[PDB]
Amino acid sequence: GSRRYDSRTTIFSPEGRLYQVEYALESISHAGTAIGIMASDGIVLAAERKVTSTLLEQDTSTEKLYKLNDKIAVAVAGLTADAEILINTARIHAQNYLKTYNEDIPVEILVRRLSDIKQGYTQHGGLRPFGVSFIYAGYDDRYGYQLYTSNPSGNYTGWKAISVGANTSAAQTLLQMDYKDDMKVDDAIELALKTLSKTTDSSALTYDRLEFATIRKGANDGEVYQKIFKPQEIKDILVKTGIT
Amino acid sequence: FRNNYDGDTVTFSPTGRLFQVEYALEAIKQGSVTVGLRSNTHAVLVALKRNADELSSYQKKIIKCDEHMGLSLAGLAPDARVLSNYLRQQCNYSSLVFNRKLAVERAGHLLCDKAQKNTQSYGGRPYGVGLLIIGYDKSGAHLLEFQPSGNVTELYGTAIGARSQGAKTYLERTLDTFIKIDGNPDELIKAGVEAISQSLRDESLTVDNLSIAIVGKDTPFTIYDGEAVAKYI
Amino acid sequence: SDPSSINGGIVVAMTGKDCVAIACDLRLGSQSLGVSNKFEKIFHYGHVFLGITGLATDVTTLNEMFRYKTNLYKLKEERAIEPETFTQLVSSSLYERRFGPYFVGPVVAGINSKSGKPFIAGFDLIGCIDEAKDFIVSGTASDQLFGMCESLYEPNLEPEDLFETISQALLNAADRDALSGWGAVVYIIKKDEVVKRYLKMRQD
Amino acid sequence: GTGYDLSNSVFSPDGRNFQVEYAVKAVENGTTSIGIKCNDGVVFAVEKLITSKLLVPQKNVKIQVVDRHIGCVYSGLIPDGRHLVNRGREEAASFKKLYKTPIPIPAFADRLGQYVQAHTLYNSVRPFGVSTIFGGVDKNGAHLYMLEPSGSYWGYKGAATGKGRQSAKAELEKLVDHHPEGLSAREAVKQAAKIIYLAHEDNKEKDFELEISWCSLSETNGLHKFVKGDLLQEAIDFAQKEIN
Amino acid sequence: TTIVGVKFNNGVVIAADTRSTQGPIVADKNCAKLHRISPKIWCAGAGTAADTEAVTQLIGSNIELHSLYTSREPRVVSALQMLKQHLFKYQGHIGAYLIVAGVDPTGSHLFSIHAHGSTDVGYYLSLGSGSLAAMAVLESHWKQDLTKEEAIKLASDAIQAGIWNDLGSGSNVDVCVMEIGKDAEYLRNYLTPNVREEKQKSYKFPRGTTAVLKESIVNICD
Amino acid sequence: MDIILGIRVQDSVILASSKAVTRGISVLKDSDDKTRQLSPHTLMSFAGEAGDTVQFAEYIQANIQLYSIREDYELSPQAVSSFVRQELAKSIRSRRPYQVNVLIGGYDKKKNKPELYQIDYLGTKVELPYGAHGYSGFYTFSLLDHHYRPDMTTEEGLDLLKLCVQELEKRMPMDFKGVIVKIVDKDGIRQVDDFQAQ
Amino acid sequence: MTDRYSFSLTTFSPSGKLGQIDYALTAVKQGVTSLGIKATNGVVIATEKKSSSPLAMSETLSKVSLLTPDIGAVYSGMGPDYRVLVDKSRKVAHTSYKRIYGEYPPTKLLVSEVAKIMQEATQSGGVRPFGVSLLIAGHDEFNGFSLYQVDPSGSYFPWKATAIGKGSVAAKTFLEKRWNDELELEDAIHIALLTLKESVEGEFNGDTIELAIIGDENPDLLGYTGIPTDKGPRFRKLTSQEINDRLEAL
Amino acid sequence: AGYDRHITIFSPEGRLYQVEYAFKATNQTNINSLAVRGKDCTVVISQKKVPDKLLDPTTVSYIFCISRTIGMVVNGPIPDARNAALRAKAEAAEFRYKYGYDMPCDVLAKRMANLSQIYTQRAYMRPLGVILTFVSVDEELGPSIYKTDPAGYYVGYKATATGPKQQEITTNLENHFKKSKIDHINEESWEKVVEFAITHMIDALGTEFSKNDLEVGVATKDKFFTLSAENIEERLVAIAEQD
Amino acid sequence: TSIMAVTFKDGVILGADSRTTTGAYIANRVTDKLTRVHDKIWCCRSGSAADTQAIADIVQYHLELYTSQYGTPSTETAASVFKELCYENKDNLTAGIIVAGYDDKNKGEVYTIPLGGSVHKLPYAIAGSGSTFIYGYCDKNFRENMSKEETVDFIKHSLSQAIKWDGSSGGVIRMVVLTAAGVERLIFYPDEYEQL
């Protein structure tokens, strides 16, 4: 028979742990670090492009920051390909909601959906889990700004500031040290850059190795705006905060 | 050896055997004894019923498939239920569609083919039961022996189960004697009760311990239990 | 009876000098009974405008559908869909229901943001694209609209003039159609700005 | 390493399929049977071990017919043989239904071939524990065939398989030489009954029963029929005579 | 609709009018009834416009993929077999009537396909409501061994017969020439014998003629 | 057919629905409530085919209550109506369509404004000051067109209805056995159990 | 019968690695070198035609394939896997784009599709990852010219220039030296011919090399005329000859 | 671990053992075959080794007639050869039906190669232990030889050989071409091209052949056929007088 | 439509008119109703052009695959395949087919498959709307084992009468001769047969 070659990706360990999930998490831990910090007037998503080259095109890229909705975006940590499969189903779910209720999908409803999908690969199907962790940054008129996180297990939680990928422990301690409830978006933009700058496994923290995005509710308007910083804008924000 | 080739039926051993099937055949021997013998007018089935406690009943071992056919089991009861039930339909089909009684030789073919399918595909297990089928069709009395391996054979008489070899020798020796017990059913039944006790050892066939079934020229397969078999104990 | 004559309504698009206009009535009825004077039939996804006449429920459904598709189109392509491309999307979307069609008569109007060239198109209920450089009509008063357009129209009209033309074409056809009227709205589109004017017409 | 002999479709380092080979062992372990192609037909014969005096004689028939003009005999696991015939019968009915003309023996061979070869492609099935000798008369001649568990099959002048497979093959090779122009149907029937008696030496311990069948354009009209009564006895004796 | 196909000494040519109707009303005064299946296999289609467009592009797409897979030029007989087996499947419900022509590694071809899936071969063919007007002209001026220009004339003339005599046909004439050795040359509006005479007056309105009730700017940018 | 009227005043939505249930030649019941509460601040009235009518309402109600529990939130009237339209628009092209017409009236606690939605069995939705399904509109729309004012008080609204119902009881051929009235406002849904003689 | 293999053949290991993807990448490593360079007005992709017998006809086997008239691809790794991938790619280009929008897909999107197909062979039941890495080069009106690399994991990234396969490391280094954001197509075709010289051991001519570019529209490669907006394919595979002429001024 | 040798998944070296072992199976019949291209024909030669005397020599072949124009010779076990032949026949039949023209040799090859690539990636399908050589006189490409293997790889050849002594035949042929400088046997009759084939077959193998030691297939414009014991004998006799 | 197949001494001949109409309009006046399914197995098509063509194409497919595996098929087998399609799908087909082939063992054979989907083997067969008018003439002039010219004449006269009376038939008379000698294509224009 075939039973011989079956890994049995969905079984419990004698300790009551999910082998594949724990190993997927171990995988994520070697991926570029991504930070998510929520201010009073906005949210900041920052990510470190793990490994690069001089020829790698930084302009025609967006390997870790993806726009889900017009009010929701995510930072990725893990298999880009796996992430794209989940991201796409997520973009579809948001649109079905919009078509059904003629209202944008509340941030948590979208996060729960995706997490449930992940959770499924955990309980049946005999397929390997998605080696991906997301940090969700979004807005809606019920909870305003929200920050979330979901991992291979299918679990998700909310945060004021959080990180995924490598050196999360170090980064979470630094964040838990200088974060403050009243923080303003630009303060957060700075905390994010500082935190990555202290956990990086690289020499310097140049602009070509970074991705930045902010969901601010531009005062001059009355609605929410998503802005994925361009190579140049990241270069600037890097000089100002004093890292040249 | 064996250890690595008896995981499932879809695997052949290096010698060319199918262990899962042989293990099935094993459950048969571990089963209670039953005997079968026929003449030219009748066919009889005598079986020894088994019980758990002394507060438990004795597991029936004779099943009627149609009015002209029936069988006795040795091994897993459930599998006999499945097989007898598949045979009940085959007989019913033949009657309804062709208005014909199913030839005993053909009933055997169907059983053989159903059993074989379970020994070539992954996931299934062989049937763990042996069957003795008697029946009076358009070509006289008949007796068949069914093996989970899918092997069915037509005999004059035979026995299966534990110590079944006793009865089988008695019969192989008494051949010329009962093969001529035509016209008289009570003789075949007595001869059967004898051959079967050749395989006894523990106790002696009691009333609620014995079970006899018969079919023939003018006898629609009927089952005898208890007081009904007293006159043979 | 005819799903295209239950609710009523009209739409018309015209091309001018470096501009395009698309107008529609505001009526939504149920046979002879008027039910709403606020049923607009023009929608836009980015800078591309789409008008839908026909069975109201489908007009609504198609709008929700194209919103859905153009939204995902923008997320993948990272650019707003163009008139010519959208026109193709409408066509293939309609034909996908070839044997169970949406009872509508779509009209596309917009200016190619990259070539600044004006664009208008029309399709039948199963997606057949009808391309014209002057005007497109649709709805229960399509004959009257053809009547007006065919006479009143002349090339390269200026925004302030095209408006007058389109408005008179719409207004006078709607008045010869029992199932149209109850208000109107015109859209004047230019490479950068879009004006929306509600016209004054009889309410009977 | 090892273990190349546990799954039915694995290629061992030398390019073999051990399971198919282990299957053959089951064939050789079986009763011997043969086929003799004559000048206008074919003859099939097989050995029937008599386990005891309880086996009704002439009742446990082994040779089988496919359609109306095909004879099939096999050595090894009997149940598998039947399964292969049941298939051939359907295979042949299908052909007749579409083309009207009853299935050509060569055409019929490939059908069984493809089917058998199929059971060596997936590890979810077991190979056939039988070798089959079959044939008949058709639009252009008589044909004799032998099919192996590997799915391999060829046309034969004479063929045999089972325990007495070597004795038989020897006798057959003689006939092939001492009859270059061709044997006759009536002749092959006798010659066959003989080769079986001889080849019964590799099992001389148990008593047996003989079975012959033939398909001759002249003797049977091209239809497969069983040799019974007088013509049978005449061949039994011809054997008992040259068995001393 | 009037569509025709004419074979000439070294190729084939197809033409069609440009009137698209809806009942007695002209929907498109200049629609194109000539469809490209592959660079050198073109199709003329009458019947339901959405169907001739759709069936034509579908097969065209599969032909392109087949071509890439086999590394060979598309054959007209392949577009013909695909078209007819598709139309046949839909038992006539896909109202497409096509005249398919083209050149390929095996010569020049001319075929016709009916909505139900039947096909015909010939040197000259016509389809559509103009079918008879055109065929009357073809039956009168066709001859074996026409020159490329003789064919374009005959074809052009046949379509005219339709434009003038059939109400379902009108406006312009589109031609497409496929020659055994050269590239297929598509001639959109090869003829335009129906131009509108200048209007008798201008209906430009004095600004302010239309009464407005409300006004506003529309938001396009996000 | 049945009477299904709805009117949106200053700070509430009023729904009037006939009480009669006629099966053939006889009037089986004279106190039928042709409505369902989709949520604490959203009410839906309905009329149409014999079985489809209640089956649809209860199906819609069930889904809305499920959403409320799953999310611990109450969907806006606009959201509920869009959901209901989609359901009807789906069934219209199905094997056996629900032949039901509905009026959805709710109070949007987030905008603090009452809202009235009219949706017919085809999935045709429109938002209105006052609406009706069936023949009801034919008798009442002229009265409402005349006397309706956006700033009417719940009281002025109940009087405008009373007038509508009277015109209906005069000119309409069928005895619809009066109506049941309900108000939807910032405080929920309540029934004016005295319109039989208000 | 029946695929009883409905479970994943690629799973996570304790260290967090995905074995089958690592191994597939190892297969790509042993493959013949291939590369791509992006100029300011074109893109060039090239590889070596490693013949498996002088009896074999090297033309009857292209390693550079056209996906759409504006997109081409090349690879390193297992040729067969590449072949079926190219077919699935050319088709998805139609079914998922041309048949909806009436135009061919933009490079990034088609790459995204290809990438998806490879991702599934990384998680779906009963299969192994594709043993190849592709370099897809194309052009689209709103994005211009671009070059992407798709790996067995399904991941993909854009490049200015890069190489994959046997001597990718050496070649990637040689490219960094000679690349600048001001190269003209011909300059890149040159740099390409040089970088590829180091990889090829034996003969280095227009018959041992396969090179195609994404440049201007070739109205002569359209097959017809009469439609203004249809100017021709931007993808052109260089001829044995066109190669040698540049091999001189090498 | 040790199972990456049983199913078709990668080994740490990025190898697929099961595909390598399938290649082994192709030499199990110990038969050699070669193919060359005439000016307007294609010939395939293959050793016919009928050991057993009880075998009907006429039913022992590894050359098949796929279609009216395509011929295929197989190197490998017979059951896998017949499986491959049936499939190819069905594919060429259907192709004609769907597209309106005969399936080209090179295309049928790609199709069979693609089918083989599948067994290379899917775990429940084992590769077929055979190498297929397709020949015909394509209407667009003239004489053609395309061969596919268990790895799913395929290519066109000027001439080629397969079997245990594959290399001896190949180098022999390689040399003949380095000499003649052309990519084919410059002959008009196929009979001569067949003779050339049988000749170089003997030189490289260093063995003499009778009329029952060979098997010949010839592809020509609009037709592919196989020679009979006697058609061959005639070919043997011809080369005899000259040596 | 007028079509027929006649078996004679050396083999068999198939004939037909060349007119296909849609109402009273002649859509095609040079139609080839004689369709090849195999080298020496042909058929005459009457009824739905779309249906018979699709049937013929499928049959040709089946015989080509039959040949790939079992060599040249019998004329009876070809008829069997036609019958299978026509009978099993009688509810969706309007096809009248005459199957004629040449075998070397069976010489010439003719099978007729009428609307129902049943098969009938005959010395000769006629079908098509125009056939009705020549039942008398044919039963009076058919003789078994005529010569090739005798048969080509029997057919030429029969169809000329059929074309004469039936407006659905017309154009040119086509024929296809099937003998051991090979396959021969004959054509006869109006000016010749109209004067018979």
Side-chain angles (χ1 to χ4, degrees), chain A residues 96-97 99-103 106 108-109 112 141-142, chain F residues 67 70-73 75-76 78-79 82-83 86 110:
Chain A
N96 293 325
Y97 189 94
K99 179 172 57 57
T100 303
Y101 304 102
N102 258 314
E103 289 190 351
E108 176 184 54
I109 288 181
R112 187 203 297 120
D141 62 311
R142 174 187 181 171
Chain F
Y67 187 101
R70 181 188 299 114
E71 240 66 59
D72 190 29
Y73 200 67
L75 273 166
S76 64
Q78 198 290 152
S82 285
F83 168 77
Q86 188 157 77
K110 191 184 221 63

Side-chain angles (χ1 to χ4, degrees), chain C residues 4-203:
Chain C
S4 301
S5 305
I6 305 274
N7 304 138
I10 42 177
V11 162
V12 52
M14 241 176 272
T15 66
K17 191 57 185 297
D18 295 343
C19 58
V20 304
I22 189 172
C24 72
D25 67 348
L26 297 179
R27 180 161 186 289
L28 173 284
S30 180
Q31 298 280 53
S32 76
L33 173 69
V35 177
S36 177
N37 39 218
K38 291 161 164 46
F39 196 71
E40 308 190 13
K41 309 173 177 61
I42 307 287
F43 316 90
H44 61 76
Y45 314 104
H47 58 291
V48 189
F49 287 77
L50 174 67
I52 331 283
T53 55
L55 189 67
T57 183
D58 285 356
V59 167
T60 302
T61 286
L62 283 198
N63 173 40
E64 299 178 350
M65 175 189 294
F66 292 127
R67 189 177 56 178
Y68 178 126
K69 293 184 179 183
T70 54
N71 273 7
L72 294 178
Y73 175 100
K74 205 187 178 195
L75 288 166
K76 306 173 188 167
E77 303 262 341
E78 292 176 312
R79 70 188 186 84
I81 194 163
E82 295 298 312
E84 303 88 322
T85 300
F86 185 60
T87 293
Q88 286 299 148
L89 179 60
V90 169
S91 184
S92 68
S93 285
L94 289 185
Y95 200 75
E96 176 170 345
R97 285 271 151 289
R98 175 57 172 74
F99 297 122
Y102 287 120
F103 301 99
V104 305
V107 183
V108 170
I111 301 176
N112 189 293
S113 70
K114 197 167 193 291
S115 77
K117 164 182 156 293
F119 186 86
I120 61 166
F123 337 62
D124 59 1
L125 75 175
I126 56 176
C128 180
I129 302 180
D130 174 359
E131 210 161 313
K133 54 140 282 181
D134 52 351
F135 54 82
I136 290 290
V137 290
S138 179
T140 44
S142 55
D143 285 17
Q144 297 92 314
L145 276 175
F146 261 129
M148 298 307 282
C149 293
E150 205 55 58
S151 297
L152 306 184
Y153 187 85
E154 66 174 307
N156 309 89
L157 294 175
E158 288 293 302
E160 301 75 10
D161 287 336
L162 184 60
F163 169 84
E164 297 296 340
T165 301
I166 243 269
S167 292
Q168 288 300 300
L170 178 80
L171 254 349
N172 291 290
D175 280 8
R176 275 292 173 182
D177 185 14
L179 300 189
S180 295
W182 259 27
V185 58
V186 183
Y187 279 88
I188 309 288
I189 296 148
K190 295 139 72 175
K191 246 293 292 185
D192 49 291
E193 85 175 309
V194 178
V195 193
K196 185 188 185 181
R197 304 193 178 72
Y198 286 54
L199 313 188
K200 169 171 183 163
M201 65 179 300
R202 18 161 23 87
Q203 305 295 298

Side-chain angles (χ1 to χ4, degrees), chain E residues 14-82:
Chain E
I14 63 175
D17 73 299
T18 70
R19 175 177 283 183
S20 167
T21 61
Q22 263 182 178
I25 292 181
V26 179
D28 196 338
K29 264 170 287 192
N30 195 192
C31 89
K33 308 180 176 181
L34 261 27
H35 307 277
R36 181 180 72 256
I37 290 178
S38 72
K40 296 189 175 184
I41 287 81
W42 288 60
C43 222
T48 300
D51 284 342
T52 61
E53 179 61 51
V55 77
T56 231
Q57 283 183 290
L58 178 57
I59 274 50
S61 169
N62 291 311
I63 276 294
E64 174 174 332
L65 292 174
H66 181 264
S67 190
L68 260 28
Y69 184 109
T70 63
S71 292
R72 289 180 172 58
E73 289 299 60
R75 307 203 183 185
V76 174
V77 300
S78 288
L80 182 68
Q81 200 85 330
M82 299 173 85

